[PDB]
Design a protein around this ligand. Structure first.
Ligand SMILES: O=C(O)CCC(=O)C1=CC=C[C@@H](O)[C@@H]1C(=O)O
Length: 252
C-alpha cells in the first residue's frame, strides 16, 4: 500500500519537492505554489484519510511515516525536500525525525512542534474527540463553518471562510475523523530537542497574522520566514510570498 499522490516530473537530477497538505486538505493544496518550481520534480501527496488516500487508515505517526517511505520508493524518489502545512508540517517533522532516506531538508508552515505537558495534551485530546464526533454525525458544511472560526483562523474574513467551507466539504467525514484522532497533536512527542539536533536542514514559514505560530517558530532553532498579509494558511492567502520564500530557501 502506498499513498495516493500526483507526480510532476521536472529536470532529471534535481531534487523532488514532496508536499503535504493540512487537515481536511488534499493533494491540490500546494499545487498553486509548487507548480512555480517547474524545474524540480513535485509530488503532491494525499495523507491517510484525505483525498484519494481516504481508505488508508493509520494508527498513528509510525504508520504515516512508513506509508510516506513506501510512497517515496514507489516513485523512485532519492533526493527530496518535505514541505508541509499545519498537520502536514507535523507529519513532515515526525517523519524527518524518525528518519527518511534521501531527505535533504524540511520546510514547515504553521506546524506545531509539540505540546509540553499532560494538561495541554488532555485538553487537545478532549477537543479533538469532540471534533471527531462532529465529523461522524453532522453536515460537513456545518462542521467546517465552525472549523474556520477556531482561533487559528480568526484572521480570515467571511468571504474566505465561505470559500473554504465549500472546498473542505468535499471530504469523507468518517475518514477525516479517523485521521484526526490518529495524528492528534495530543499524541505527538515534543520535537523541540530533536529538531535542535537535526541532520537535515529545517525551515519555518508563518503568516504575519498567525499569532500562535509566530510565537512557536521563535522557540525553534530554525530560520523563520514571515509571510506578509497572511494568516495560518499563508501559501493559500499569499502564494507569491511563499513562492519567494521557498525560492530563497531552496536555491541558496
Ligand atoms: O487548514 C485547515 O483547515 C486545517 C489545518 C490543520 O492541519 C490543523 C489546524 C488546526 C488544528 C489541527 O487539526 C491541524 C494541525 O495539526 O495544524
Amino acid at each position: 500500500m502506498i499513498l495516493h499522490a500526483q507526480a510532476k516530473h521536472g529536470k532529471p537530477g534535481l531534487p523532488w519537492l514532496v508536499f503535504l497538505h493540512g487537515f481536511s486538505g488534499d493533494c491540490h493544496e500546494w499545487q498553486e505554489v509548487g507548480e512555480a518550481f517547474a524545474d524540480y520534480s513535485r509530488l503532491y501527496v494525499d495523507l491517510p484519510g484525505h483525498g484519494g488516500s481516504a481508505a488508508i487508515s493509520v494508527d498513528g505517526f509510525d504508520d504515516v511515516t512508513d506509508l510516506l517511505r513506501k510512497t517515496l520508493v514507489s516513485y523512485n524518489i532519492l533526493d527530496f525536500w518535505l514541505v508541509g502545512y499545519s498537520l502536514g508540517g507535523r507529519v513532515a517533522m515526525m517523519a524527518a525525525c524518525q528518519g527518511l532516506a534521501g531527505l535533504c531538508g524540511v520546510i514547515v508552515e504553521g506546524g506545531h512542534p509539540g505540546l509540553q505537558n499532560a494538561e495541554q495534551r488532555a485538553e487537545r485530546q478532549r477537543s479533538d474527540r469532540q471534533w471527531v464526533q462532529r465529523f461522524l454525525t453532522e453536515p460537513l458544511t456545518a462542521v467546517f463553518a465552525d472549523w474556520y472560526q477556531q482561533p487559528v483562523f480568526a484572521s480570515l474574513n467571511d468571504d474566505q471562510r465561505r470559500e473554504l467551507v465549500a472546498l473542505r466539504s468535499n471530504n469523507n467525514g468518517a475518514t477525516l475523523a479517523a485521521m484526526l484522532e490518529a495524528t492528534s497533536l495530543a499524541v505527538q512527542p515534543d520535537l523541540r530537542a530533536n529538531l535542535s539536533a537535526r541532520t537535515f536542514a529545517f525551515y519555518y514559514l508563518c503568516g504575519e497574522r498567525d499569532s500562535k505560530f509566530r510565537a512557536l517558530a521563535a522557540e525553534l532553532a530554525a530560520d523563520c520566514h514571515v509571510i506578509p498579509r497572511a494568516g495560518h494558511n499563508a501559501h493559500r492567502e499569499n502564494p507569491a510570498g511563499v513562492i519567494a520564500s521557498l525560492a530563497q530557501i531552496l536555491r541558496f
